[PDB]
C-alpha cells in the first residue's frame, strides 16, 4: 500500500524501535541468569518475532538502493552497540552445542552418572580457542549450581535451541535481504561478519 508505506517512513517510528532494541538486549541477557524465571523468556522471544516481521513488511516490494532501505541500515548504525549484543548472544549457544559433543571435551568429564565439576568446565573452555574470558564467566554464571560440582551439560545445551530456533532465522532473512538491496555500504558489512 505504497501510499501507506511512506507515511510510516515519515513518522516517529524509528526512535521507537531503537528503544525497543535497547530494552530487548538486557532482559534477554538478565533473564538467562536464572532457572525459575525461564518461563517468561519464551514469550519475550515471541515479541522479537512479531517485531522483526513488520520490518520485512516495510521492506517488501522495494526497489534496489531505495529510500526505504536506506533508513533500515541507517537506523541500525545509531543502535549498533545494542544490536551486536543480541547477535553475540546467539553465537554462544550455537557453538556450545558444538563444544559439548566433541570428544575433546569428553576427556575432562570423568563421572559415570554424567555430571561435571565447575573448575574443570572453566579449564575445558579455556583450553579451546574463542570464548573470551569474561564470556566464560557469564556462561558459568548462567549454569546451574548445588554442591559446586553438579553441572549437567547434556541438558544445559538443549535449553535454548527450540525456544530460540526462530528469531535467529528471521534475523538471517533480515540481514540477507538488506545485503542484496543495498550492495555497497561499509556500515552494513561490519554487522555481516559478526
Amino acid at each position: 500500500c505504497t501510499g501507506n508505506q511512506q507515511s510510516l517512513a515519515h513518522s516517529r517510528l524509528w526512535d521507537a524501535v531503537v528503544g525497543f532494541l535497547h530494552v530487548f538486549a538486557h532482559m534477554m541477557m538478565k533473564l538467562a541468569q536464572d532457572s525459575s524465571q525461564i518461563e517468561l523468556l519464551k514469550e519475550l522471544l515471541d515479541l522479537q518475532k512479531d517485531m522483526v516481521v513488520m520490518l520485512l513488511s516495510l521492506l517488501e516490494g522495494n526497489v534496489v538502493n531505495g529510500m526505504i532501505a536506506r533508513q533500515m541500515v541507517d537506523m541500525l548504525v545509531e543502535s549498533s552497540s545494542n544490536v551486536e549484543m543480541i547477535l553475540k548472544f546467539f553465537d554462544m549457544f550455537l557453538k556450545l552445542k558444538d563444544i559439548v559433543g566433541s570428544e575433546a571435551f569428553q576427556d575432562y568429564v570423568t563421572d559415570p552418572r554424567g555430571l561435571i565439576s565447575k573448575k574443570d568446565f572453566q579449564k575445558a573452555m579455556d583450553s579451546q580457542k574463542q570464548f573470551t574470558g569474561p564470556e566464560i564467566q557469564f556462561l558459568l554464571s548462567c549454569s546451574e549450581a548445588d554442591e559446586n560440582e553438579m553441572i549437567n551439560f547434556e541438558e544445559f545445551a538443549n535449553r535454548f535451541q527450540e525456544p530460540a530456533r526462530d528469531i535467529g532465522f528471521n534475523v538471517a532473512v533480515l540481514l540477507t535481504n538488506l545485503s542484496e538491496h543495498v550492495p555497497h555500504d561499509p556500515r552494513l558489512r561490519n554487522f555481516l561478519e559478526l
Binding site: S102, E103, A104, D107, S127, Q128, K129
Partner: protein, 49 residues
C-alpha cells in the same frame, strides 16, 4: 583410502611433495578443537607436545 593409513605415523611422510611440513601446520588448524595431546602421536611425530 585406508591402505594409506599406514604412512602417517612414520617420521618421513613428506619425501617427494616439496612441503616437508605437512605435519606441523595441520597440528595448528584443527588443534584445540580436537585432542591436542592425541593428534600429537596419531600423525607420528612424537615428542611434539
Amino acid at each position: 583410502g585406508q591402505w594409506d593409513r599406514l604412512v602417517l605415523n612414520t617420521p618421513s611422510f613428506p619425501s617427494n611433495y616439496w612441503d616437508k611440513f605437512v605435519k606441523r601446520k595441520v597440528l595448528d588448524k584443527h588443534g584445540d578443537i580436537f585432542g591436542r595431546e592425541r593428534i600429537a602421536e596419531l600423525l607420528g611425530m612424537d615428542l611434539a607436545s
